[PDB]
Design an enzyme around this catalytic site. Structure first.
Site, mmCIF file in Angstrom:
data_model
loop_
_atom_site.group_PDB
_atom_site.id
_atom_site.type_symbol
_atom_site.label_atom_id
_atom_site.label_comp_id
_atom_site.label_asym_id
_atom_site.label_seq_id
_atom_site.Cartn_x
_atom_site.Cartn_y
_atom_site.Cartn_z
ATOM 1 N N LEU A 1 -1.048 0.618 -8.660
ATOM 2 C CA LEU A 1 -1.769 1.794 -9.131
ATOM 3 C C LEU A 1 -2.526 2.462 -7.992
ATOM 4 C CD1 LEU A 1 -2.617 3.442 -11.649
ATOM 5 C CD2 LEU A 1 -4.471 1.835 -11.939
ATOM 6 N N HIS A 2 -3.123 1.660 -7.109
ATOM 7 C CA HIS A 2 -3.784 2.198 -5.927
ATOM 8 C C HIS A 2 -2.799 2.976 -5.068
ATOM 9 C CE1 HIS A 2 -6.601 2.441 -2.589
ATOM 10 N NE2 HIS A 2 -5.663 1.956 -1.797
#
Length: 189
Positions: free
Chosen positions: A30-31
């Site tokens: 997600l980062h």
RNA sequence: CUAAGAAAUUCACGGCGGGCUUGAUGUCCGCGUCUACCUGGUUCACUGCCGUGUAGGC
């Protein structure tokens, strides 16, 4: 009305279940996803799935309105898994009011770093670097654990997430996200 | 209410000395030990715009 979309993801069971590491790869992907997208307009939460306040949930909910959502990590913009989740699809939110907050925190449990920073900062001596003010007497700590190996140029972090005031008190229209990858006032269930 | 009822044994010593146990021997033959396994639920880590100033940062 705050950020009116949610993804009730459910990490399925699997005979390999390090939850720190599953949520590690998920939050890390997600980062990567949102630094590739770019923008401080996104939400992330963790609904009431922590039964005790030690464990952390086997679920997730991302809160981006329309465009950031549909363009970011979703059915488009590959996750790279598509099998270990078999997740769903979002929709509009209902009207709760638990005051909508989540938080990031980090503590100190390794005074070697602090003593070394003293030695580096103004060339401290070994005796005072040994007893000026370390925290050797007691090792602070935090309960909700996720691993999150370094994005690059580093090694295994151990990140801690504290759900903020989730009181049924009020609501406010605040900023979109603090930190880097974590919304501010977020709707909670 | 006892075969009741009572009672100072006390003193010392030189066990001495000598010696050939001897010879000899064949343990001797065998053996299928197999079979399948996730060390993972964990490494609280190098820093630094830091605040060494117990909250503060990727």
């Amino acid at each position: 009305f705050t950020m009116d979309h949610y993804l009730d993801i459910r990490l399925r069971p699997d005979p390999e279940f390090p939850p720190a590491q599953l949520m590690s790869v998920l939050f890390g992907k997600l980062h990567q996803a949102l630094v590739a997208q770019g923008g401080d307009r996104i939400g992330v939460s963790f609904p009431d799935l922590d039964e005790s306040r030690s464990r952390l949930g086997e679920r997730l909910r991302i809160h981006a309105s329309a465009d950031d959502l549909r363009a970011l990590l979703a059915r488009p913009w590959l996750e790279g898994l598509r099998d270990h989740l078999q997740f769903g699809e979002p929709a509009v939110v209902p009207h709760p009011t638990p005051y909508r907050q989540v938080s990031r925190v980090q503590a100190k449990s390794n005074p070697e770093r602090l003593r070394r920073r003293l030695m580096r900062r103004h060339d401290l001596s070994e005796e005072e670097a040994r007893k000026r003010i370390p925290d050797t007497v007691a090792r602070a700590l935090d309960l909700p654990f996720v691993t999150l190996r370094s994005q690059s140029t580093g090694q295994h972090f151990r990140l801690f997430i504290r759900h903020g005031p989730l009181q049924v008190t009020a609501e406010e229209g605040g900023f979109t996200c603090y930190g880097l990858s974590k919304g501010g006032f977020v709707p909670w269930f």
